[PDB]
Amino acid sequence: MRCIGISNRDFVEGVSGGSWVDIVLEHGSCVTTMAKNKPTLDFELIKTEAKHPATLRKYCIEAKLTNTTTASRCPTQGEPSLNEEQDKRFVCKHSMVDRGWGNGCGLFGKGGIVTCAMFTCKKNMEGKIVQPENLEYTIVITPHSGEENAVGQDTGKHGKEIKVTPQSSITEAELTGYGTVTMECSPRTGLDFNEMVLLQMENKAWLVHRQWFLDLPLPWLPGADTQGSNWIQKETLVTFKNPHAKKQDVVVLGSQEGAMHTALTGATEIQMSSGNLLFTGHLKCRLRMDKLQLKGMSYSMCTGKFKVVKEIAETQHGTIVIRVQYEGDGSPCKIPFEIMDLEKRHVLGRLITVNPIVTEKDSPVNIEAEPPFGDSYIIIGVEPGQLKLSWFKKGSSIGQMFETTMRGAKRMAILGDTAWDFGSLGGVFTSIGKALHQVFGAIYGAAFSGVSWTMKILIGVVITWIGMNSRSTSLSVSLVLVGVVTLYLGVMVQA
Amino acid sequence: MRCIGISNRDFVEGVSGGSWVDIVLEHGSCVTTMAKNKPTLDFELIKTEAKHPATLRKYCIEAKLTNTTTASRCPTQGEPSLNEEQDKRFVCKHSMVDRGWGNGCGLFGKGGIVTCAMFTCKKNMEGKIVQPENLEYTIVITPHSGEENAVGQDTGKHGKEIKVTPQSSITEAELTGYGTVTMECSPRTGLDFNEMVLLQMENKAWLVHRQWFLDLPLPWLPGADTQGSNWIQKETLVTFKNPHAKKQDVVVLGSQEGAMHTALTGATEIQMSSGNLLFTGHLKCRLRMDKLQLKGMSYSMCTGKFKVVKEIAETQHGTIVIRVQYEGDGSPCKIPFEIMDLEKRHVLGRLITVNPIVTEKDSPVNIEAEPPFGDSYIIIGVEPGQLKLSWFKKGSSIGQMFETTMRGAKRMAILGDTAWDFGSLGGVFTSIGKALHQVFGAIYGAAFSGVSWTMKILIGVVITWIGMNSRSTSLSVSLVLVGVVTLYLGVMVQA
Amino acid sequence: MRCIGISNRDFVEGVSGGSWVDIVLEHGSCVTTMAKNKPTLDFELIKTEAKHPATLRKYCIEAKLTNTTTASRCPTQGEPSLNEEQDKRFVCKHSMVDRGWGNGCGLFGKGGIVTCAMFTCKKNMEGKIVQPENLEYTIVITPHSGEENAVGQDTGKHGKEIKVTPQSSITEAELTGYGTVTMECSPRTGLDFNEMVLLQMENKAWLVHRQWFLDLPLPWLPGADTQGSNWIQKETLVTFKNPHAKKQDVVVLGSQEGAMHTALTGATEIQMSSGNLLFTGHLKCRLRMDKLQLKGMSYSMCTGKFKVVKEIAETQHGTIVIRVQYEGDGSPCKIPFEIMDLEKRHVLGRLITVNPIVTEKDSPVNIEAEPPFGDSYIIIGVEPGQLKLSWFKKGSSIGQMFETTMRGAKRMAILGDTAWDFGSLGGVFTSIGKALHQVFGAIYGAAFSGVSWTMKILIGVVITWIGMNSRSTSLSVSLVLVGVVTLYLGVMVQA
Amino acid sequence: SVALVPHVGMGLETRTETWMSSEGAWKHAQRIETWVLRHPGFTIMAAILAYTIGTTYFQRVLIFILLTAVAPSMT
Amino acid sequence: SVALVPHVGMGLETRTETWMSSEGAWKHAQRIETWVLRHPGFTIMAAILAYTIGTTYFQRVLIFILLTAVAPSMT
Amino acid sequence: SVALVPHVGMGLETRTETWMSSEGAWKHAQRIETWVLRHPGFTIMAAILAYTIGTTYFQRVLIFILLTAVAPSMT
Ligand SMILES: *[C@@H]1O[C@H](CO)[C@@H](O)[C@H](O)[C@H]1NC(C)=O
Ligand SMILES: *[C@@H]1O[C@H](CO)[C@@H](O)[C@H](O)[C@H]1NC(C)=O
Ligand SMILES: *[C@@H]1O[C@H](CO)[C@@H](O)[C@H](O)[C@H]1NC(C)=O
């Protein structure tokens, strides 16, 4: 029940002929899966670890200068020479300075001048890479079970956490009383590692684009370097001054920690202090329901009286959760639960905590259900003393449809074609849509790479105007669709 | 003899009816003035102090957070509040976090969350301001005496140093043997302080625009605060991260010294360690030559031999210098210096060190002269032992005219509408041009302020093309001229 | 008489009002000057010296690679690192090799590889520059004097040597018995040593263009190095090999001595081992004959027999030289010499050794004369024993005019506009011709710089064709003239 | 500087909030607004140039927006 | 941040070398060149949009240049 | 190599013979002739191309000569 209380919750209903459903698990989100006569598990992706990283490159964000020396050459006589120019750890620069009888030359022209200074780094911005093989994922599966303190407990109690790695395609969890749950997760198709860099800087880390990190305009070492002294591109972190063509000097150009923090705008943050922990991204899994059981299956109905120990509370997703305690005999029995209309003729509600059971007499099982829109009615227990509770739900079916469409669109914006197999059950139309989305997304991503959201909005407005002012209806409609999609992506991007 | 060896030397010839000439002295430049009956003088603006600076802001470039406190209320329950929200030395922000039974609230919504942390500065910038009446300009006047060590000398006692302030703007300098020179300057119309800030970093200083300093996006203190603890834009130096909707916290953004160095591009660097010293800018002065006489005009021609002790050398202006020594009698005597053709029938060049004289026999004297572009001969002395020195000049009058025109254009580009005072002697054309330049420069600056050189080049190209294809011939010519001027300015800007 | 038998001999006849004649002295050429009532003199520029050279650049023409190391990195993770890459004394390159489980890396692909080697110079050529004021020209002036061994005497025993330097514009040579000869040379406008480099490789030297020297693609050091180890572009003298995308290697290219000999094809050799004295170029001189009385005019005449001891010999320029022996009395007397017709009625010769005298009566005297085309007779001595020696010129006045025109054209080709100063008095026609030649040569040298003679001939043919097949008669004439001049220059160049 | 090249449009974003998303969302717009406020003269010139160059009102508005956005940017 | 307002068109420039003048002279051009190299997809789309929106060739070129220069800039 | 880019058109020639003037006067033409002898195929193709890009016998001859002279000398 760990999903009860999460705003990014998703409900996955139904399995395929093989009794499997493929789901996508995002960090900060969890998926509630239910199927006819199945234990209704909650899935959340809680950890992503990277092991055995290789330092791709090192950068200098803070350097100092020492041993500043200079040499000069009389005009027309070539350039000056310093011995420091042989050592690559000295930053040298050639300029020209006025020369004449006053300053010691026999000629009156621009003479050569060279300034050098030892370049020593003070602070680093090491960046690492990992192969997908060392890409362990931690997932926690929680059966609902209506346990007393399991309604929103994220500590992991009552749930089993499985580790998903590329080594094993199959992950097995034995849920006590519920059977076994099999996960076929694709850790290699989630975050596209080996084109991303794990960037560490002063006890902070970020997950960054590999090319963008290799293009950073800072002094850097190969990453296989050991001496740490042959910094290349040191000129990006130094300044040479020749104000009036009389003298040349060198300064070290100050720390770049704030500049790098500004440059890391749009990149997600990660923990590299201990173990390279990531808490962003998704994971596509195929969930097998074959060996899942209902814990209360083969129990009798509870014929005793029930009491409400925690009043009905409505969740962010149109469901309600109530806690009831059983005061009757036959303690291991299954709770009679129904959501009916005000006339008590139809069963209007849908139960998420399917097959609620009283495991122990004095144990407050809490149940979740999805009431209909309006004046649904909740019945707990059997006729002699059954609880007789009324509920109203605010929204409407049309509003729910609009919210669902927006949620699907946002999933298609966060994820690419990977959004197409979020709750897929085989399906040929799903495959066709995924392929079409793959092609269209490749084109769109190639056309919109490296662009901010304001630029995307500008381009969307331009394209929509072009479509609106198009003489051909087909081209006009296509351009309007492209512009609307671009406007939506610009509005939703950079989150 | 001090302007020799400086690439930015200017020549001012002639005075007005009043025996004065307007000149503009720049820090990195030297001015030599010549009049019909006056000694040649060299002028250099060497120093520009700013006294009694006052701070107006103390921007923070590196801070830290210590005391992080948090408060969340409940969904539907309004916003939480912390005691630190009223403490101006704490940085605060409100967010929303998922709430429910698992969190201990009991309503399943987004509950307000506010986190604060104490803000402490570690490094800051002091934007000092100096009122315009505390500026002091130091101008060195050195006459073309001909001393052996006077050529290119930058620290000799041959010249005289005059201090110029907005109060004592008119000063007089006694030049031993050359009368007195009166300088009537206008320091109030130079750098135009009261619109500028003296920005001081850890060990470096800049002269920056006051509005640009006031608009900087860092946290600042009023400048009179002894205790600090009331920084204004603390939010610009911290980041509040709320990944997903579970928790909120705040971290500092890292040292901004490098970012401020990057932002300080385009501002001339200054010195502020041992006083506020500005080796940049210009000063307009009116030079009174009336009490200025040539030394030794009542002397006889030497009538003896000379020996060249320093070979004739050409400066990067078209003038030549030479050091000769006298072995003859009547040592305090005029030196017979001429630049003629091979047959000694025409005077081809002129003397820049006018009235060369020998004061002490065993004291070499170095003369400067401007020879013609072709081949010329320097004749020093008279028939017995007279030395004739061949010299060739590699330029031409057309090239010299082009260089003079380009130098004037560059002076206009730097000293906008003040270049019309550089060597003026009054006049109606000069005044009309100065007024027209003032009007056009005001209009141009209104339309090009804040624009980079690349943008100026783009705008100039656009304006030039518009003028090129324009119906009106007068409008076409005017627009093409404006675009050409803009293109030249963009080519010459940011030096 | 030093000038007889050179094949590059110019006869300068006459002087201007002032008794000065312009001449240009070439190292391979020689000038004989004749004027009314003045001795015939021979001028030969025999030596040009450059003193106090400054080394501009040193190039490496042979090198050896040692200390070859290599490092490789695994594919898709960074670049390899070598400590030796820290030192600029090593030549380093980065390449890509194939990597896989066979090479010891975890993954397959292109891995980075770096090869290093120490670059040591074995043989280098040094480029030295000289200031024009440091040049010294050695001119030998030899009066004819008809001495026994003065004909073609390269020893200079009879002639006087004068050193021409930029320090003194007037050079005086006292010829015993002939007065004093004054020369005002211009050793500044001849060879332009400010644009030239004195290059030596090993026991050889050349005078090369400074820009061509600076553009040579060889590893080089500044003239001020003092270590000879930090060579700038060592990649030009080495080659890295990666034949099959594995095992990158580096080798040294080999001695560039022969390649540099080929590169120096169009340069002129010089001497650099014994004081870098170069026997090439020309020196423009103004010769003054004011104080050059004829020798031995007080002697009366020779009354005695003359015996021919060396028969008349034709010279390459149409002058005959005869050596005679005086057998009579009155030893210091004038030799009665004349070239007359058969009847001895008309004087038709022109004595070049003016006033031939006999000094010792045992030393033979050498007499040079210019006979006319056709038949002529040399008359020696008084009637008793008078010699009547017939001679036949075997030429023509028209052919002589054609030869003179060709010689002048070839001097224009070699000397440029300086040819107008050869044997030139002060004339308006010469001045206008020299100015026009200067303008046309300024255009032509700009248009035809850096091209070979074959290219010049092709361009001349093209221009001649364009001019001749042109409708305009003025354009046709101008283009045909330009093409013919270009063709002549291409035919007459590369010597 | 590095700050001139942020990590905004790299296509690696997830449902997790990025480093300085809230801060860096409207900072460019705020900077352009402040620049236009501080330099009205260039805004008038850009408007006039857009009107002259552009033939249609759409072209004129687009050019004006592009010029106004690029002016502070290229600095 | 502060680096995005780099005291460029403030006037006040004299005949003395300014702070980081040589670097800042061409840093923006280098950045645009690198961005165009790394994002060829946007450049083609900008070229197509400039061709479509602008009628005359001068308008098309101006629009394409402005779009290319403002694309990385909006950051 | 330095063997290329010789010291030919430097304008410093005097009446004195240069380093390898007599030897190097005709070497370029000699090696062009040897190349044309060894590669008749390219000469025929160059002639055909020159005729195709013609409109005048002068143009044909000039183009053919330039092509035949530049082929042995590139890379
Ligand atoms: C730099 O200077 C220090 C003295 O402060 C000296 O000990 C050191 O050897 C020098 N290093 C180099 C590379 O010159
Ligand atoms: C901040 O925390 C420190 C403990 O490290 C405490 O001593 C101090 O009083 C606190 N200051 C506040 C909360 O203002
Ligand atoms: C180069 O190799 C030689 C021989 O192995 C060795 O003595 C020398 O120290 C080496 N030098 C360097 C710089 O590695």
Side-chain angles (χ1 to χ4, degrees), chain B residues 107-414:
Chain B
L107 204 67
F108 286 113
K110 288 180 179 292
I113 190 170
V114 59
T115 180
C116 304
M118 190 184 291
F119 182 99
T120 305
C121 179
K122 297 143 84 159
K123 304 289 180 66
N124 62 80
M125 301 189 292
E126 291 181 355
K128 290 152 184 291
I129 50 166
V130 297
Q131 54 275 35
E133 69 268 14
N134 293 115
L135 273 292
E136 189 183 72
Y137 297 69
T138 310
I139 296 173
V140 184
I141 303 96
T142 188
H144 273 55
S145 310
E147 299 279 0
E148 54 178 326
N149 295 318
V151 162
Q153 182 66 257
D154 285 350
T155 179
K157 266 197 154 296
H158 303 124
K160 183 63 68 71
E161 284 183 354
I162 65 171
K163 298 291 186 289
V164 170
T165 77
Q167 295 90 15
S168 296
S169 180
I170 298 168
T171 195
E172 179 265 330
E174 173 65 28
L175 300 174
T176 303
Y178 303 88
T180 74
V181 71
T182 293
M183 290 291 272
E184 184 185 355
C185 307
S186 73
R188 273 171 209 298
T189 59
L191 271 181
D192 181 15
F193 293 74
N194 276 350
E195 297 293 327
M196 302 175 82
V197 176
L198 278 78
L199 182 46
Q200 173 180 42
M201 199 79 85
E202 299 293 325
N203 68 338
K204 293 188 283 290
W206 292 265
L207 173 71
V208 307
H209 189 226
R210 194 187 286 238
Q211 187 57 222
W212 175 95
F213 180 76
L214 294 179
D215 287 349
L216 278 174
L218 296 160
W220 54 271
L221 282 183
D225 288 342
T226 307
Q227 68 207 348
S229 70
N230 191 20
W231 298 88
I232 296 305
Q233 318 185 324
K234 287 184 286 272
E235 314 91 16
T236 58
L237 201 61
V238 304
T239 178
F240 287 88
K241 64 146 156 175
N242 189 359
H244 321 116
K246 322 172 194 151
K247 182 176 72 175
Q248 196 205 20
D249 52 0
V250 67
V251 296
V252 287
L253 276 185
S255 165
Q256 302 294 319
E257 165 160 46
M260 254 305 292
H261 283 158
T262 290
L264 284 158
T265 68
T268 61
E269 183 177 1
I270 59 159
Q271 307 309 130
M272 283 168 65
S273 296
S274 65
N276 314 84
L277 297 186
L278 287 78
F279 302 100
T280 175
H282 70 85
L283 176 78
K284 187 272 177 185
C285 298
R286 159 154 321 167
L287 178 60
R288 305 262 199 203
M289 291 183 183
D290 50 287
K291 271 87 74 174
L292 212 61
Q293 71 262 15
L294 291 161
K295 181 175 180 176
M297 287 301 293
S298 80
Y299 282 166
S300 302
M301 215 169 53
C302 281
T303 72
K305 294 180 189 291
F306 294 86
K307 67 182 180 181
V308 181
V309 301
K310 191 71 176 291
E311 292 293 325
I312 181 168
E314 185 178 5
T315 73
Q316 46 192 347
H317 308 299
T319 79
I320 61 171
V321 57
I322 190 167
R323 192 172 297 151
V324 296
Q325 189 174 2
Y326 191 63
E327 57 263 15
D329 299 333
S331 304
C333 50
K334 304 183 168 192
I335 288 173
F337 192 102
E338 289 288 325
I339 293 166
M340 307 190 79
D341 53 340
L342 189 42
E343 287 305 317
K344 296 198 290 181
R345 287 179 183 266
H346 305 100
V347 168
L348 289 194
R350 68 177 182 178
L351 209 44
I352 284 156
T353 306
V354 290
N355 198 35
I357 60 157
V358 173
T359 76
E360 156 57 42
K361 186 187 161 58
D362 60 19
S363 180
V365 64
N366 45 16
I367 299 96
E368 181 182 1
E370 190 207 65
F373 281 99
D375 52 352
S376 49
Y377 308 82
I378 297 89
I379 299 96
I380 294 140
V382 291
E383 286 283 320
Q386 160 186 98
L387 53 81
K388 192 175 180 181
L389 275 298
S390 169
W391 184 257
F392 185 84
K393 216 192 199 193
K394 289 174 73 173
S396 85
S397 291
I398 305 300
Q400 194 185 62
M401 289 166 173
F402 184 69
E403 292 176 17
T404 296
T405 313
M406 296 304 290
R407 188 197 301 120
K410 200 173 179 309
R411 171 144 38 230
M412 295 174 79
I414 293 171

